[PDB]
């Protein structure tokens, strides 16, 4: 019912249903997120910016609220939003 | 003597006596927090915003001080305050 | 040669020598830190603010540089400095 | 093919190829990083500032972009840049 998303060593735990709200995104589509699945550790691994992911995850948890963390510059966060295919 | 609270993968450890100071809150009421308990892991699980939780825990630690962290926007923090029933 | 310091669920790992450099403080004095030792998990446990502790630990690691994390208000951080007996 | 970097208890995970991009840095040089390796913990351990490391990692992830995080003071960050041999 929940999966583990490991962002450069930082492990997040989220419900599958939470991710399923946005099926056109990377994490919302099983076919896209499967490219980052690590079958040996039973988790999805992303070699990316850690401080951005709290906000990416919150976008799903909140049902659509996208906010940039103060400590992540706009150009860096905008690249993460593009990578996670939230537009 | 200690309880584990897992906020989307991030684990917090707090004495039950400290939560018990505020019985009208979610975490201070046995009936309410039981809805989020996981017997296998012996922890409470919330699929919620991570940055906000340091200030939620500080509310219990400080004996009732409610302080918004500078990196958590006011509308987000106010929703977390209402969810955990700290008002 | 290393000890584990658990601040409300957040585990820090520090060389004993790093702490020993300031023997008049809580963590640098064997008798003061012993009050917070947990023989079950072989770690020191503090029911305190998490965001402050990176800075407290960095005071030892850097050989004496004490800086307040931008995300922790001055009154809260000053209370932590007193608790850890850094003066 | 992954490397675990433990900064005072905080674990970071990166692909070895990512560090390998910059062979003249501490983490990109096998001989230099070997001094910090722990065979019994298959990880490299640094007793250093935690908040600075997200930005050290982002230098490798970004293909060489060096960005001072907003809540890490310049003198502290500059010392970490020097220690990891990024310049």
Swiss-Prot record, chains A, B, C, D:
Effect upon mutating residue 10 to A: No effect on channel opening
Gene name of this polypeptide: Kcna2
UniProt subunit comment: Homotetramer and heterotetramer with other channel-forming alpha subunits, such as KCNA1, KCNA4, KCNA5, KCNA6 and KCNA7. Channel activity is regulated by interaction with beta subunits, including KCNAB1 and KCNAB2. Identified in a complex with KCNA1 and KCNAB2. Identified in a complex with KCNA5 and KCNAB1. Identified in a complex with KCNA4 and FYN. Interacts (via C-terminus) with the PDZ domains of DLG1 and DLG2. Interacts with DLG4 (via PDZ domain). Interacts with PTK2B. Interacts (via C-terminus) with CTTN.
Role played: Voltage-gated potassium channel that mediates transmembrane potassium transport in excitable membranes, primarily in the brain and the central nervous system, but also in the cardiovascular system. Prevents aberrant action potential firing and regulates neuronal output. Forms tetrameric potassium-selective channels through which potassium ions pass in accordance with their electrochemical gradient. The channel alternates between opened and closed conformations in response to the voltage difference across the membrane.
Other observations noted: The delay or D-type current observed in hippocampus pyramidal neurons is probably mediated by potassium channels containing KCNA2 plus KCNA1 or other family members. It is activated at about -50 mV, i.e. below the action potential threshold, and is characterized by slow inactivation, extremely slow recovery from inactivation, sensitivity to dendrotoxin (DTX) and to 4-aminopyridine (4-AP).
Post-translation changes: Phosphorylated on tyrosine residues; phosphorylation increases in response to ischemia. Phosphorylated on tyrosine residues by activated PTK2B/PYK2. Phosphorylation on tyrosine residues suppresses ion channel activity. Phosphorylated on tyrosine residues in response to CHRM1 activation; this abolishes interaction with CTTN. This is probably due to endocytosis of the phosphorylated channel subunits. Phosphorylated on serine residues in response to increased cAMP levels; phosphorylation is apparently not catalyzed by PKA.
UniProt subcellular location: Cell membrane; Membrane; Cell projection, Axon; Synapse
Substitution effect: residue 8 to A: No effect on channel opening
Domain-related comment: The cytoplasmic N-terminus is important for tetramerization. Interactions between the different subunits modulate the gating characteristics. Besides, the cytoplasmic N-terminal domain mediates interaction with RHOA and thus is required for RHOA-mediated endocytosis. The transmembrane segment S4 functions as a voltage-sensor and is characterized by a series of positively charged amino acids at every third position. Channel opening and closing is effected by a conformation change that affects the position and orientation of the voltage-sensor paddle formed by S3 and S4 within the membrane. A transmembrane electric field that is positive inside would push the positively charged S4 segment outwards, thereby opening the pore, while a field that is negative inside would pull the S4 segment inwards and close the pore.
Effect recorded for residue 2 to L: No effect on channel opening
Outcome when changing residue 18 to A: Alters voltage-sensitive channel opening
Region of interest: Tetramerization domain: 1-87
Impact noted for substituting residue 47 to N: Alters voltage-sensitive channel opening
UniProt tissue specificity: Detected in neurons in dorsal root ganglion. Detected in hippocampus neurons. Detected on neurons of the anteroventral cochlear nucleus. Detected in neurons of the medial nucleus of the trapezoid body. Detected in neurons in the brain cortex. Detected in axon tracts of the corpus callosum, specific terminal fields of the brain cortex neuropil, neurons in the medial entorhinal cortex, and in puncta representing mossy fiber terminals in the hippocampus mossy fiber tract; these puncta correspond to synapses made by dentate granule cells.
Section of the entire sequence shown: 33 to 119 of 499
Effect of residue 9 to A: Loss of channel activity
Effect recorded for residue 49 to A: No effect on channel opening
Protein name listed in UniProt: Potassium voltage-gated channel subfamily A member 2
Effect ascribed to mutating residue 38 to A: No effect on channel opening
UniProt effect for mutating residue 6 to A: Alters voltage-sensitive channel opening
Result after altering residue 76 to A: No effect on channel opening
